[PDB]
């Protein structure tokens, strides 16, 4: 734990980590039960909830969604491009996961019944810590001690495990979720930076950008070895405090060392 | 050749070929296919939970198609942001570009999106402006103003004060 304490003090805030080796059952835990803002990392679970609903509602993923300029929000690289043609639910899901597309995320939340709809899905798979209260972009406020739009590193990791390696999703949907995470383009400098370039990694990042608040969670497949699931979240006391991708990568390395990886 | 930048964005012109776009941006910053279909998407430095970027649309999937669409986030800064929830509430549907700029400030806006469905003709041109207040262009407090044929179709804002 000492190395974590040192890392977070160098950073000037708080760091929460939870990692599990799915081969040995071993874990590493640092502030793993404290709340941290989800930021964009909620989009990963958003995609899973879409996939879960598609098991109940046939043809859901192939439904073309038409939207206009009124639905765009800042940081929507994919949905902005398909404004004239629309996008399917599956395409919106991939954009939210892989490019943190904001307009796509709000469109999907709409399909699920909003923030309470996503929260209800998370409850349904056994996650009682997760809470989404607001939409993009309001959910990114990251105000210290505000419990809105937060979860904990442990709950994040436990849910991630159930969804990617467990039975929370049916096999075809589970594989789609995994494939989407593997294709993420936003996390090259975080957890992915802590592992060999030839190890398969699926991840979702989040960056509120205020209060030094940022994060990443991942499933990592070490060649020949059983997968590791981990979440690294950061938080800092002052609005103008900067987040650090380097700190997240360093925390990931520490957690992996702790697992004997 | 560096990362994608505003200077590169500006230097890239409507009517150009994919090859020219790549020449200027540096193919290493750029991708195509996948989620971007036949468009070319180029990344600059980290920003938001993504990267500053440009996206270039082409008249067709064909090899000699031309740029008919230019989009960017965080590659161009506003010259003099003065937007407020007051002025924003003064902007009304039907205004011309000039009318809108007078209202929000002629230094407050950057071009988010610019698309010519009938390229090289400008008929039906659609325009998205991203407009910022005091500090809005930082990493907070901005607006989206969209036009068709130079007439304002709508507006939306986030955390204007």
Swiss-Prot record, chain B:
Classify the main location: secreted
Q: Which spans of this chain does UniProt mark as sequence repeats?
A: 1-76, 80-161
Q: List the disulfide bonds.
A: 30-42, 109-131
Q: Which domain of life is it from?
A: Bacteria
Record note on what altering residue 130 to K does = Increases binding affinity for K.pneumoniae beta-lactamase SHV-1. Decreases binding affinity for E.coli beta-lactamase TEM-1
Claim: Signal is one of the keywords in the record: yes
A single cellular component GO annotation:
extracellular region
Q: Which GO terms describe its biological process?
A: regulation of beta-lactamase activity
Q: Where in the cell is it found?
A: Secreted
Which keywords does this Swiss-Prot/TrEMBL entry list? Disulfide bond, Repeat, Secreted, Signal
The protein's role, per its UniProt record: Inhibits a wide variety of beta lactamases.
Its assembly, as annotated, is: Interacts with E.coli beta-lactamase TEM-1; interaction inhibits hydrolysis of beta-lactam antibiotics. Interacts with K.pneumoniae beta-lactamase SHV-1. Interacts with K.pneumoniae beta-lactamases KPC-2 and KPC-3; interaction inhibits hydrolysis of beta-lactam antibiotics. Interacts with E.coli beta-lactamases CTX-M-14 and CTX-M-15; interaction inhibits hydrolysis of beta-lactam antibiotics.
What name is this protein filed under? Answer: Beta-lactamase inhibitory protein
């Amino acid at each position: 734990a000492e190395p974590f304490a040192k890392l977070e003090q160098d950073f000037g805030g708080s760091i929460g980590v939870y990692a599990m080796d799915t081969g040995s059952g071993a874990t590493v835990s640092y502030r793993a039960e404290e709340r941290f803002p989800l930021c964009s990392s909620f989009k990963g679970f958003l995609a899973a909830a879409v996939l879960a609903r598609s098991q109940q509602q046939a043809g859901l993923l192939d439904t073309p969604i038409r939207y206009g300029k009124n639905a765009l929000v800042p940081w929507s690289p994919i949905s902005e491009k398909y404004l004239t043609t629309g996008m399917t639910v599956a395409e919106l899901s991939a954009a939210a996961v892989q490019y943190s597309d904001n307009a796509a995320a709000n469109l999907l939340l709409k399909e699920l019944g909003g923030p309470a709809g996503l929260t209800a899905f998370m409850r349904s798979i056994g996650d009682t810590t997760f809470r989404l209260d607001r939409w993009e972009l309001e959910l990114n406020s990251a105000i210290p001690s505000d419990a809105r739009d937060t979860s904990s590193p442990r709950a994040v990791t436990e849910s991630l495990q159930k969804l990617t390696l467990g039975s929370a999703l049916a096999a075809p949907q589970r594989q789609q979720f995994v494939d989407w995470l593997k294709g993420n383009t936003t996390g090259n400098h975080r957890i992915r930076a802590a592992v060999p370039a030839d190890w398969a990694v699926g991840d979702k990042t989040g960056t509120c950008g205020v209060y030094g608040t940022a994060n990443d969670y991942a499933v990592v497949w070490p060649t020949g070895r059983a997968p590791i699931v981990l979440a690294v979240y950061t938080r800092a006391p002052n609005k103008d405090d900067k987040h650090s991708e380097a700190v997240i990568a360093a925390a990931a390395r520490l957690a992996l060392e702790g697992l004997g990886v | 050749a560096g990362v994608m930048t505003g200077a590169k964005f500006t230097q890239i012109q409507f009517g150009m070929t994919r090859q020219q776009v790549l020449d200027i941006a540096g193919a290493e910053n750029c991708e195509t296919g996948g989620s971007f279909g036949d468009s070319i998407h180029c990344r600059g430095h980290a920003a938001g939970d993504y990267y500053a970027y440009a996206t270039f649309g082409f008249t067709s999937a064909a090899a000699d198609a031309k740029v008919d669409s230019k989009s960017q986030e965080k590659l161009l800064a506003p010259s003099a942001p003065t937007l407020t929830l007051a002025k924003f509430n003064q902007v009304t549907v039907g205004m011309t570009r000039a009318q809108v700029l007078a209202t929000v400030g002629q230094g407050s806006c950057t071009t988010w999106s610019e698309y010519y469905p009938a390229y090289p003709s400008t008929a039906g041109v659609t325009l998205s402006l991203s407009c910022f207040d005091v500090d809005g262009y930082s990493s907070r407090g901005s607006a989206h103003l969209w036009f068709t044929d130079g007439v304002l179709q709508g507006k939306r804002q986030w955390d204007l004060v």
